[PDB]
Amino acid sequence: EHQNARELLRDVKSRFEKEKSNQAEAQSNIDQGRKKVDALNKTIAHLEEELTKEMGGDKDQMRQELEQLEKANEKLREVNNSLVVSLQDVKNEERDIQHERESELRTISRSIQNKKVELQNIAKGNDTFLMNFDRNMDRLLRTIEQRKNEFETPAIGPLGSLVTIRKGFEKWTRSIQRAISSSLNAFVVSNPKDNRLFRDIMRSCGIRSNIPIVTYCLSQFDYSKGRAHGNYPTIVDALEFSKPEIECLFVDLSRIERIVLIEDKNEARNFLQRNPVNVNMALSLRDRRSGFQLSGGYRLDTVTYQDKIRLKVNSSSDNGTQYLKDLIEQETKELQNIRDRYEEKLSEVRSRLKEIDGRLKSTKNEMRKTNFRMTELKMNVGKVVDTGILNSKINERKNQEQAIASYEAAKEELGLKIEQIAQEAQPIKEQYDSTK
Amino acid sequence: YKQIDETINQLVDSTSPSTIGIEEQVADITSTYTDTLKILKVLPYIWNDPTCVIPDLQNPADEDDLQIEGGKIELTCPITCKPYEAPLISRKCNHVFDRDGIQNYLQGYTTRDCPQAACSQVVSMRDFVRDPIMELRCKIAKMKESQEQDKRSSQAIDVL
């Protein structure tokens, strides 16, 4: 009849709150750590580059740029070499055009080389062609020439005064002289045996000459034969002589006086070609100075002039630089226009000089810009840097985050304990109270 | 009736590290209209120090010298006895010592004197009683004299 049971529970209830106390500590540690690490990272997250970019942004992108710049420099030096290869050819053309300028100068001015004012050779004196095969042939002639003129019918021989023309406009006097060129002199002895001997005894000043010898005499057939008419100058009736037939005894091949022979630009074209009848041959010159003897049959012949004063070109008035006027005053204009057509290419080479100079200067400036850039690149690669803080702060964030994860890993099972422990412990509370 | 008694037993909650003064609030606890009340009548002075003496047996007013003949309530001694955790007190004049000690200090023969006060007492623990008087002493002593270690060391090491 006693009251038996005593209190038994006050002690066990503690374990519940004892373990529950960790609910505060775990979450407090997690919150403190994560909030503090986030606050500290708030700085670094944007302060990694407070000063790093200002000077640091060059080195990397310019190190990527060097691959362009170095090869572009090589390319521009190579195209500068090609530019020099063009300029050297330009100055090759320069020396060439110098060659052509001297060439054209000489070609146009070689009218000076022999006939500038050569008209004044004798200068008020007197001279003759009577001994002209060498400058010393006069010893052959001077006072022994008289022993020739006795083998002849009316005198034939030197033709000295016979080759002089009376007045007459200058231009036409080429054809008859060209014709007589075949028989320029006609000394002779009738004997056929002395052919060599007489010419050989005529060697009183050597045999360095080309003396011609002719046996032919006056021809005989009348002057009333088919004479032409005067519309353009003819120089057959222009000579004084001992006998008229002197100027006719070669007519067999010098057929000039009995034809309607004309020139190229007048009297209907190409009647020279048209095989004239009742006459033998009438071929005529093409051009006044060098043009050949036009023909429509037997072929042409040249008239490239060759002659000299040989008696006196000036016999009434004697001086120069007045009458023969046009040639030099037009050769000056030829010099002028040749200079023009060469100075156009001189301006071309000047323009090419401007082009190459501008290209070279532009390339020099472009390359010097890149030289400064690559100097600064290769240089600032070795810049001052503060990488230490970046790594330190990143590591501080990382290790702290790992610690936070470790903290979080511990809460769940420790929290799980409490529910089952309380289920075990609590229900006796009502039990002892009911037992009371 | 009856159950009105227990109530104030929770008094032992007086244990408080942050105590600054208990002189007044301990008074009215005795109001009522037990051994716990008896020990309450004397224990409050322990907060000052547990090793003091103010004997009701000679005079509760004032002390005579600083010698006790019965000890300063020591806790350990390397040449006399290992630390104290379970003392048992006498019923006559406060003779007290460890429970587990005398069982071998008097192994076989009981009537022997007690070397504690230079006086004759030749009876042993079989007539002793449970000791509720010791509870406060070591508990307050350690709580008071261990908390000074942290502050000085912390302030000496925090210089930099």
Add this chain to the structure above:
Amino acid sequence: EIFEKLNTIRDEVIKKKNQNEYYRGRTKKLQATIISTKEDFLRSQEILAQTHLPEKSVFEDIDIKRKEIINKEGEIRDLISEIDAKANAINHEMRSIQRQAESKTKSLTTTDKIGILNQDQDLKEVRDAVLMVREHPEMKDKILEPPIMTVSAINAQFAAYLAQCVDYNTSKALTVVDSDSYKLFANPILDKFKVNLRELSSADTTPPVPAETVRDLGFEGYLSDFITGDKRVMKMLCQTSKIHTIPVSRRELTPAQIKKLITPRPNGKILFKRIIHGNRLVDIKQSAYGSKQVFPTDVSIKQTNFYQGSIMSNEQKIRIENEIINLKNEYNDRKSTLDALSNQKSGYRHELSELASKNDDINREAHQLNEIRKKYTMRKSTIETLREKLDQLKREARKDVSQKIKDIDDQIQQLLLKQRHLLSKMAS
């Protein structure tokens, strides 16, 4: 009435009091943190021990290395300023080699007779007229070339001997064998330049007097000693002159001695088309309107060089041209060799630039080493952030724990006063 609730408070203390240890335990965490961090700061001082301030010349070693890089650039530009001169020199050298080429061609001119025609002024027109025809094939039914180059006369005196065979005008004219082809040939050129042509109708080649014959004593093989050339040109030599009938005994003779031929021969009307004996040449024409007398007329001649394969000779030739040719060749080639040695100097300048690049590499290595040791200095400096992180953290943690102790313990101790509420409605 009723029996009242009695205490029912009892355990209310526990749920507040027991929280006292909550950060009294954290005190140990505080102490562990301070001790560990103080040891860390001692390690930071150990790091302080190795001062080695960055190298003494940073602020001016930077200027130095700047100077070396600008020296690299300067040397490169200086060397290229002369590689341009090398380009000029090599271009002039190749032009000089071209000059050497055409000079050698002019020198080693082959057996061809083209060169002789250069003696006269306007005959370069004929030269070009033949040159463009030679260069391009076209089609020539009867190919025809100036006869001067297409004959093999024996010697210069014999060249004179046959020079008056045809006139200078003829020598600058192109013969034709198919008389029908008057102008068919001239499609490209027509009449641009100064040349003419010669016709052909007949020719003859028979051995005259090849036996005991019209005279008493024999002598010599007849006048065909050696004259050969183009088929058309030789047909012309026959048609226009008939040289194959002149009675040439190389020694002395006179027309009176020739008069045994006065009577008719395969040669018809009295006398020949032409006579030549040594340096003496004769002309024949009919005296139709004279005394009907037979008349030969003689002319003397001198040396001629055309119609023979030896254009000029080593004795005179166009010779000083060869001397100047080789002379300018030698000067230009030796100038090119001097330029090549200057280019060897330029290659040594390239070597100097490579040595400058070695200097650049060494200086960059030194600067990179110094910058990595500056990174070590930055490592040393990070302890400042370390200690600043420690200082506020430790103090704030200790403040928080101490204030929690203060407040919570005071709150619990004051709640202990609830005890007074228990001395209550039981009696008085």
